[PDB]
Amino acid sequence: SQQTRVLQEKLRKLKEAMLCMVCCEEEINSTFCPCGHTVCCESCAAQLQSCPVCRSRVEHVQHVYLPTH
Amino acid sequence: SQQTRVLQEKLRKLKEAMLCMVCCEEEINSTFCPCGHTVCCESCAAQLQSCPVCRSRVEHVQHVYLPTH
Numbered sequence: 001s002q003q004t005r006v007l008q009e010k011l012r013k014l015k016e017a018m019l020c021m022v023c024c025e026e027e028i029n030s031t032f033c034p035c036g037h038t039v040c041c042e043s044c045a046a047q048l049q050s051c052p053v054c055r056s057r058v059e060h061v062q063h064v065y066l067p068t069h
Numbered sequence: 070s071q072q073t074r075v076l077q078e079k080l081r082k083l084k085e086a087m088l089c090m091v092c093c094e095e096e097i098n099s100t101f102c103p104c105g106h107t108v109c110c111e112s113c114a115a116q117l118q119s120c121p122v123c124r125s126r127v128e129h130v131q132h133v134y135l136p137t138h
């Protein structure tokens with residue numbers, strides 16, 4: 001039904017929000033510290049000097065294990 | 070249709086996977102460091118000396134800003 005189409009769209013949007021903001025292909029699993037923005041996969045987070053969201057200096061990257069992985 | 074019911078169940082499970090595994094009421098937004106398990110809200114994470122997934126000591130809690138928030 002039309003309701004099935006609405007639910008498919010909600011699911012698709014939530015799943016897309018879990019993907020890396022740089023490559024759009026891999027799941028987010030890395031946090032820039034200390035700011036806390038968690039928006040990249042490990043590969044894309046590895047060479048950024050500053051956060052792509054807030055511009056804060058990246059002191060290090062913390063790996064995150066999420067139940068949605 | 071029956072697919073509407075199946076999609077409602079998938080969406081409910083994905084949403085539940087984003088809620089704190091301890092209180093079940095607030096969104097996950099905290100990482101136990103250094104292990105990286107990101108399973109709690111800030112209120113539950115502040116009360117745990119050991120990670121509830123792996124039992125490693127919590128040295129500190131890192132707040133995470135996720136695009137799904």
Ligand SMILES: [Zn+2]
Nearest residue numbers: 020023041044
């Ligand atoms: Zn990436």
Ligand SMILES: [Zn+2]
Nearest residue numbers: 035037051054
């Ligand atoms: Zn940031």
Ligand SMILES: [Zn+2]
Nearest residue numbers: 089092110113
């Ligand atoms: Zn909680």
Ligand SMILES: [Zn+2]
Nearest residue numbers: 104106120123
């Ligand atoms: Zn742990």
